[PDB]
Structure formats: C-alpha cells, structure tokens
Design a protein around this ligand. Structure first.
Ligand SMILES: [Zn+2]
Length: 255
C-alpha cells in the first residue's frame, strides 16, 4: 500500500476490506450541519511531562515517538472517558499549498494536518487499544501557509537525517505544546485510522483553529522520500486520503 497510482487509496479496500466500512476517516466537516453539543466538556491536554524519544521515517510519513510507559503526556475530558496516552505524532501534507489535510472544512483543504495519537490506558498497550471502538483518540490540527511556527523548527531541521524509509534519529526534549493553536474548540465524531489497517477505533478531535507555518517549513516536508536508501527517489508528498462518506454519523461541535 502507498499513495501512488497503483497502490493508492482507491486500492486499499482489496487488502483492507474495512476500507468501505461504516465509520471510515477522514471526512468533510459541514459546519452548518455540525451539532452544537452543550454536554461536551473542555479538552484536557497535559503534556508538560512529555518525553520525546525519536523520529523516524516509516515510508508513509515521519513519526515523533514518545515514552508511553507512564501517564506523562495525556489527553482527557472532551468527548472522552478515561485517560489517553500520547504515543506519537505525524503529519499528512500535499505537493502544493492547495492540498494535504485529511479532514476538510466545508470542502476547504489545508496545506497539511497534524495527528496527535493517543491510546486509552484501560487497554494496557496500543496494540490492544487498536482493537476497541473507544481505543484511540486523535487530535487533528490544520496547518495553513503564512508565518513560521517557531515550535515546529526543531522538527524541520532534523528531516535531513531521516530522508529515506527506515531512518530514525534520537529526538529528545521536544515539547508538543509548541504545536498547539490558541483555542481548543473542536469538532468530534467516531471514525477510523486514515491509513491501513484503517481500524475503526478512533474518536476524532479536530480543532477549529489552524496553526500557521511558513512556506519554507512545509517545503522541507516535501523533500522527504517514500523510498528506501539507494532506491529510485519518490518524494513524500500527498500522503493523504480522500474524504469518506459520513453515513449517518453526526459531527458534534464544542462551540
Ligand atoms: Zn495521521
């Protein structure tokens, strides 16, 4: 599987039948249709104690991994029940500024989208969590081209080091708080992972307010390779999936 012409998203259903399931992601967020839910509690993001370990290129993106052996970086409140632990964060981007995000707002596409992946600690390990309907909680944040995001530069500068698939580099003392927008207003719905196994275990939390990055920042993203070292170079661009049918599901708003 990949994002090419012959292994792209339109082909995933052959290996992952769940691809045409009932609670597939990403989706278009219709802001006129979204339901203002007053019973929705404020998000609780506790990342002061976050411990970043490394960064790796897994051939479909780059993942910043965290120490999830303890309740160090957690997400709670909002639509969630219990505590979710941050395990990694990554992005989906485009070849142009006009595309890249997974989720769309009123059909509008952003330059990229940041996914903060958390797993429900009642299940003991990520592996068990991915087997539950309430297994994961993913924080999605839109990225728009404008002014530079200072907080994101440490990640941009390390990309040289993990240009190809399978490369990883030590990445300690990275503070994820630098990537958050000012407001934590959000939309939420029941969905799935946006890449294979495309397991329908995620509670989606998409922030309303996008963060801005400079053209130079997002450009460095586009210099990445899908391919392994000493293979024909394939730039890592457009690692996003077409929006899926909401199919009855309802998108709730905290605002
Ligand atoms: Zn993602």
């Amino acid at each position: 599987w990949g994002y090419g012409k012959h292994n792209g998203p339109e082909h995933w259903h052959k290996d992952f039948p769940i691809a045409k399931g009932e609670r597939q992601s990403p989706v278009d967020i219709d802001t006129h249709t979204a339901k203002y839910d007053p019973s929705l509690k404020p998000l609780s993001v506790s990342y002061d104690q976050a411990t970043s370990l490394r960064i790796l290129n897994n051939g479909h993106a780059f993942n910043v991994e965290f120490d999830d052996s303890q309740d160090k970086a957690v997400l709670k409140g909002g639509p969630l029940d219990g505590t979710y632990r941050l395990i990694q964060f990554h992005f989906h981007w485009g070849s142009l500024d006009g595309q890249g995000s997974e989720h769309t707002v009123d059909k509008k596409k952003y330059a990229a989208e940041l996914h903060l992946v958390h797993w429900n600690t009642k299940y003991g390990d990520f592996g068990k969590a991915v087997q539950q309907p309430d297994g994961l909680a993913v924080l999605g944040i839109f990225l728009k081209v404008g002014s530079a995001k200072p907080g994101l530069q440490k990640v941009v500068d390390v990309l040289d080091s993990i240009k190809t698939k399978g490369k990883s580099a030590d990445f300690t003392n990275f503070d994820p708080r630098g990537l958050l927008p000012e407001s934590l207003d959000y939309w939420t719905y029941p969905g799935s992972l946006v890449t294979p196994p495309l397991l329908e275990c995620v509670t989606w939390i998409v922030l309303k307010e996008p963060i801005s990055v400079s053209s130079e920042q997002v450009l460095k993203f586009r210099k990445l390779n899908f391919n392994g070292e000493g293979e024909p170079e394939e730039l890592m661009v457009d690692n996003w999936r077409p929006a899926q049918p909401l199919k009855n599901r309802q998108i709730k708003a905290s605002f």
